[PDB]
C-alpha cells in the first residue's frame, strides 16, 4: 500500500518583508519513503536546500522537513514542488504567509 504526502509550505517566523527568515516545506503522511522536494523562488529551483533526517509517525508514515534561508518580499513568489510514487505529476504548493 501507498500513501500520498501531505504538504505545507510556511515560514519559521511570521513573514515581514525585507526581513531574513526560513522557508519550510513539511512533507508528511507518506509511504514509501522516496520523495523529491524542491523549494522554488519565482518558479526556479533554490539551490542548497537542507533537510531533516528521515523519521516516521506512530502510524508508520514518513515525514521530512525541507528548509532554506530566505528574505520574503512583496513580489517574490515561493513554492514547494513535491514528487512521490503516488503522484502522477509533481504537486506544487505556493507559499502563502497567511497559511
Amino acid at each position: 500500500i501507498q500513501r500520498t504526502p501531505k504538504i505545507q509550505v510556511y515560514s519559521r517566523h511570521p513573514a515581514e518583508n525585507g526581513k531574513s527568515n526560513f522557508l519550510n516545506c513539511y512533507v508528511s503522511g507518506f509511504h514509501p519513503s522516496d520523495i523529491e522536494v524542491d523549494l522554488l523562488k519565482n518558479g526556479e529551483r533554490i539551490e542548497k536546500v537542507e533537510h531533516s533526517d528521515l523519521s516516521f509517525s506512530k502510524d508508520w508514515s514518513f515525514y521530512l522537513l525541507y528548509y532554506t534561508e530566505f528574505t520574503p518580499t512583496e513580489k517574490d513568489e515561493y513554492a514547494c514542488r513535491v514528487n512521490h510514487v503516488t503522484l502522477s505529476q509533481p504537486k506544487i504548493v505556493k507559499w502563502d504567509r497567511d497559511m
Binding site: 510556511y10 519559521r12 519550510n24 509511504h31 514509501p32 533526517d53 523519521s55 516516521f56 497567511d98
Partner: protein
C-alpha cells in the same frame, strides 16, 4: 513531567542500487538527539543535540557498533520477509521499527514499546506486558515462534526496565534546560473575508514545545469539530512547532466564536477571540 525515549529504524531495499539503506534516529520527546545512516561516508552514530555530546568516546563506539550490526540484521530481515511473503527480488521494500520507553514525572517506567512494520503494515509488536508478542499474520507468526524460542521478550524487558529508563533519566538531567522546559504557544486570531457573507477566522499557535497541543473553535460555546479546518502540527525548524485551526463564519457573527488552546506550557487553557 512525563517523557519518552524512542529509536526509529528504517531499512529500505533498492534492487539494482546496492544494499538496503539502514537509518536510525533517536528521540527524547520531540527532540532528535542521535542519527545513523549506512549511506554516510563513514557511517556512525552522530550527536544531534548539544546535551548528548558529553558522552565519552566509548559511548559512541558502542552505539556505532550497535547500528553497524543492525545494518546487517535488517538486511537479513528484508531477505527473510521476502521469502515469508513469496515476493520477487525485483521490488523495493521497507522495514520499520520503533522501540523505547515512557517514564512518568518521577522517572519510573510507564511503558515499553518494540514494534516492527513491513511495507507500512504491522508485522510484530511486543505487547504492553513485555512478555508476549502480537503477530499480524502467518508470516509474522514464524518470527514470533523464533522469538518465543529465543526468549527475545525477556531481553527486551531487561532493556526496557533498565538501560532505557536509566539513559533517558541521564539525558533528561543533562538536557534539563531544554528537554524539561515547555514553551507555551504564542497565539493570535486572524480575519480573512472570503466573500460578502463569509469570513475565515484562523487561530494560530506558534513557538511551542513539545508538539502536543489542542486547538479548537467554539460557536456559542459548542465545539465546531466538523466545521473546523485543522492543519497538522508542523516543525518551525528552531525546535518549536506550529498549528492553526480555521472556521468559516457568517459576516457579523465573529464574536460568537472563541478559540481554545491547551498546551502543557500553559497553566490554564486559553480562550481567544477575533480582536478587531
Amino acid at each position: 513531567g512525563s517523557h519518552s525515549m524512542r529509536y526509529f529504524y528504517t531499512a529500505m531495499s533498492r534492487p539494482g542500487r546496492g544494499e538496503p539503506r539502514f537509518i536510525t534516529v533517536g528521540y527524547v520527546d520531540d527532540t532528535l538527539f542521535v542519527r545513523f545512516d549506512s549511506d554516510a561516508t563513514s557511517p556512525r552514530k552522530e550527536p544531534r543535540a548539544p546535551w548528548i555530546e558529553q558522552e565519552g568516546p566509548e559511548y559512541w563506539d558502542r552505539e556505532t557498533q550497535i547500528s553497524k550490526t543492525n545494518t546487517q540484521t535488517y538486511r537479513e530481515n528484508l531477505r527473510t520477509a521476502l521469502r515469508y511473503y513469496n515476493q520477487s527480488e525485483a521490488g523495493s521494500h521497507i522495514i520499520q521499527r520503533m522501540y523505547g520507553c515512557d517514564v512518568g514525572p518521577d522517572g519510573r517506567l510507564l511503558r515499553g514499546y518494540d514494534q516492527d512494520a513491513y511495507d507500512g503494515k504491522d508485522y510484530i509488536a511486543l505487547n504492553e506486558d513485555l512478555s508476549s508478542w502480537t503477530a499480524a499474520d502467518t508470516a509474522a507468526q514464524i518470527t514470533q515462534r523464533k522469538w518465543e524460542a529465543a526468549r527475545v521478550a525477556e531481553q527486551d524487558r531487561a532493556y526496557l526496565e533498565g538501560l532505557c529508563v536509566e539513559s533517558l533519566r541521564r539525558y533528561l538531567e543533562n538536557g534539563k534546560e531544554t528537554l524539561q522546559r515547555a514553551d507555551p504557544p504564542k497565539t493570535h486570531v486572524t480575519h480573512h473575508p472570503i466573500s460578502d457573507h463569509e469570513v475565515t477566522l484562523r487561530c494560530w499557535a506558534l513557538g511551542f514545545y513539545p508538539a502536543e497541543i489542542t486547538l479548537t473553535w467554539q460557536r456559542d460555546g459548542e465545539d465546531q469539530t466538523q466545521d473546523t479546518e485543522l492543519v497538522e502540527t508542523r516543525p518551525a525548524g528552531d525546535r518549536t512547532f506550529q498549528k492553526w485551526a480555521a472556521v468559516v463564519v457568517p459576516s457579523g457573527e465573529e464574536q460568537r466564536y472563541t478559540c481554545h488552546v491547551q498546551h502543557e506550557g500553559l497553566p490554564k487553557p486559553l480562550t481567544l477571540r477575533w480582536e478587531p
